[PDB]
Design a protein around this ligand. Structure first.
Ligand SMILES: NC(=O)c1ccc[n+]([C@@H]2O[C@H](COP(=O)(O)O)[C@@H](O)[C@H]2O)c1
Ligand SMILES: NC(=O)c1ccc[n+]([C@@H]2O[C@H](COP(=O)(O)O)[C@@H](O)[C@H]2O)c1
Ligand SMILES: [Mg+2]
Ligand SMILES: [Mg+2]
Ligand SMILES: [Mg+2]
Ligand SMILES: [Mg+2]
Ligand SMILES: [Mg+2]
Ligand SMILES: [Mg+2]
Ligand SMILES: [Mg+2]
Ligand SMILES: [Mg+2]
Ligand SMILES: [Mg+2]
Ligand SMILES: [Mg+2]
Ligand SMILES: [Mg+2]
Ligand SMILES: [Mg+2]
Ligand SMILES: [Mg+2]
Ligand SMILES: [Mg+2]
Ligand SMILES: [Mg+2]
Ligand SMILES: [Mg+2]
Lengths: 91, 94, 95, 97, 92
RNA sequence: GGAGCGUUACGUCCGAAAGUCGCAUUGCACUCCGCGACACGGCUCUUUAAAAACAAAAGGA
RNA sequence: GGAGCGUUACGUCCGAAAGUCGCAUUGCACUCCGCGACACGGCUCUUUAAAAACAAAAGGA
């Protein structure tokens, strides 16, 4: 809701495989700043969702609302801030 | 409907026969009903395969209808009927 | 009853009528080929010809050996009944 | 003025590689020309008339204009295509006899 | 990783192997001597092909020049082919 | 309602063919041919037989 | 038993389990993990992966 190092993306094409998605997401979000990591899981609870962990918050914000709705594998991205800090960031 | 007119409208004619040949072939088989004033033929898109026959009298035409309906003509069976309007006619011959 | 006079052509019946023509015609060729050159196999599902086939051999000895070796052989759950053809097949009389 | 060439739903292609069997040539032509719109037929012949040449008959005349403009000089079997609108139906029937 | 061989995908899959090869030659011969075109319609190769050029020069020009080129109504991706080992595994 | 249209499944050929389930049949042929039954969206036209498009969620090889 | 063989339906192509369909699921983690399906006669060899052949009563498009 409130800014954070890590952006929460959902409404993602659930049929892309974990590895292709990460690299696709990397290509289009790396222009915004350094990506620490992208978490992807094809869980029931976690499919269609990604967490991109930026090094700097400013990179996250700039990415969040400039890529909002970006068409990606034929579905518009919905991007919001993660409600908690990612583990790597709060350690 | 289609009120008796001295002009008859004919179609299902073969379209390969030349205008002028078709014209006098029609003249021969239709003169035995009355004195033709004119026969209107053309192979435009909308007059090919069809013709108008104009006698002096309406009796001539009403008789050529019934006598010559289905008549085999260059291997096709003629389809005759009365002209609808002296307008439709002038509108087929552009 | 049966036709015992040797002929180039054997007449099988008691065949399974549910079998399709060219499966039967080719299953027959698979089980009879080893007796000699087969000139033709004739199958017909018509009313009076279903259930039954003619296998034409080049040599009467093939036919005899085929008739004798295969009598009663179980075939699509029916044992073939085999006899000789009452008359020659046309392919034959030419020659 | 110089007159604008009259469009046609059929395009005349030449400077084609004559070493290609005519039935492959059609199929390869369909591969690069179906994007511009529906093809109704492709005309090739082994007669000396049609040597190195073909006609691609489109449904819509707009499609032949896009294909003529987009694929002019396109290299095809290592030989650049020369494309023009076909003239008449009677012209095609002559070279296809 | 520039290489003798290009890997084409997003190819129309409702086309027969023999024709696909001959059509891919008609459009790629311009760039160099094609040593072979590898097509197959297996679940693993369908919609894809390998084109092998004598020289790496030719695969580079082909990859850039023919990128997205519309072909059987579909625009092709041309990527560089991986290793000979990867290729032999995709054919079967 | 009735006719005409057989275009369409991967994508061809059929749809007056075929296949399938019944019922009959133990039968000697060389060209076929027992009986019964079991699909199809749409578009024309209006007792006529033409016109020109067209479906795999509907049948068979 | 186990490997290799994908030839076959009208008759072409296919017949990938680190995979593929189908159904569910819009879900805030830092993590294995929703549910349901994936047919096939036979040949050949015997932990080798070669070699020639081959079925629609068995799966697709
Ligand atoms: N579309 C056509 O050209 C065409 C022609 C004949 C039959 N059919 C189909 O066959 C079915 C039975 O045809 P009829 O009702 O014309 O005998 C129709 O309902 C129609 O679906 C279609
Ligand atoms: N005849 C062949 O060349 C061939 C090859 C592969 C599979 N098959 C069929 O596929 C089935 C499954 O085969 P596998 O036992 O090789 O998985 C076999 O039982 C066989 O029916 C046949
Ligand atoms: Mg993308
Ligand atoms: Mg058996
Ligand atoms: Mg189709
Ligand atoms: Mg058809
Ligand atoms: Mg009918
Ligand atoms: Mg209907
Ligand atoms: Mg049926
Ligand atoms: Mg059949
Ligand atoms: Mg054993
Ligand atoms: Mg196969
Ligand atoms: Mg067929
Ligand atoms: Mg067959
Ligand atoms: Mg599962
Ligand atoms: Mg064998
Ligand atoms: Mg078998
Ligand atoms: Mg398919």
């Amino acid at each position: 809701t409130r800014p954070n190092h890590t952006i929460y993306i959902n409404n993602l094409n659930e049929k892309i495989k974990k590895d292709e998605l990460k690299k696709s997401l990397h290509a289009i979000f790396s222009r915004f700043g350094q990506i620490l990591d992208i978490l992807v899981s094809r869980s029931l609870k976690m499919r269609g969702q990604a967490f991109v962990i930026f090094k700097e918050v400013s990179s996250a914000t700039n990415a969040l609302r400039s890529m909002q709705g970006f068409p990606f594998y034929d579905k518009p991205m919905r991007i919001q801030y993660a409600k908690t800090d990612s583990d790597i960031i709060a350690k």
